[PDB]
Amino acid sequence: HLNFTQIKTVDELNQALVEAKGKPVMLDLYADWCVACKEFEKYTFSDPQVQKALADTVLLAANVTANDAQDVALLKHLNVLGLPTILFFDGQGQEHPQARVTGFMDAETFSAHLRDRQPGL
């Protein structure tokens, strides 16, 4: 398993971004009712080469299972329309929307995505 730091709100994300100055960041958004999110955890975040590739990346995640007010505010703020979504931030805490992942990617596909599109590295 990869070690994700849980964030709940917009400003916990922002703070995490500020604290991560100089490092690449990755924000995974999941929910318990999300089938493809679990696929990601089981078949992709579990890959030995995927994990190596994220070794130096700050790992954040938001559990939006409850779809409460803070969850919805976070999703809006990030313009996230469905799950799974993964967002990527460079070393200045800026997002690179062109690196978003918005469906399941298998290990080989996600490796290639990180190699070809991951920011801040």
Author numbering: 428 to 548
Mind quoting what the paper says about this structure?
The transmembrane thiol:disulfide oxidoreductase DsbD is a three-domain protein responsible for shuttling electrons from the cytoplasm to the oxidizing periplasm of Gram-negative bacteria. Its central domain (tmDsbD) is located in the inner bacterial membrane and is flanked by two periplasmic globular domains (nDsbD, the N-terminal domain, and cDsbD, the C-terminal domain). cDsbD, like many proteins involved in periplasmic oxidative protein folding, adopts the more conventional Trx fold. Its role is very specific, to acquire reductant from tmDsbD and transfer it to nDsbD.
In this work we have found that replacing Gln-488 with an alanine residue, which cannot form a hydrogen bond or a salt bridge in the active site, has a dramatic effect on the pKa value of Cys-461. Despite the presence of reducing agent (TCEP) in the mother liquor, both proteins were found to be oxidized with a Cys-461–Cys-464 disulfide bond clearly present. The cysteine pair (Cys-461 and Cys-464), Asp-455, and Glu-468 of wild-type cDsbD overlay well with the same residues of Q488A-cDsbD. The only difference is that the side chain of Gln-488 is absent in Q488A-cDsbD and replaced by the much shorter alanine side chain. The carboxyl side chains of Asp-455 and Glu-468 in both wild-type and Q488A-cDsbD are oriented toward Cys-461 and remain in close proximity (<∼8 Å) to the N-terminal cysteine of the -CXXC- motif. The side chain solvent accessibilities of Asp-455 (9%) and Glu-468 (57%) in Q488A-cDsbD are comparable with those in wild-type cDsbD (7% for Asp-455 and 42% for Glu-468). In wild-type cDsbD, the hydrogen bond interaction with Gln-488 stabilizes the carboxylate group of Asp-455 and results in a pKa value of 5.8 or 6.7, depending on the oxidation state of the protein. In Q488A-cDsbD, the absence of this stabilizing interaction leads to a further elevation of the pKa value of Asp-455 to a point where it becomes indistinguishable from the pKa value of Cys-461. The phenomenon of microscopic pKa values occurs between Asp-455 and Cys-461 in Q488A-cDsbDred and, as a result, in a fraction of the protein molecule population Cys-461 has a pKa value of 7.6, which makes it significantly more reactive and prone to reoxidation compared with the wild-type domain. This was apparent when we measured the activity of this variant in the full-length protein in vivo; Q488A-DsbD was only ∼75% functional compared with wild-type-DsbD, consistent with part of the protein population being compromised.
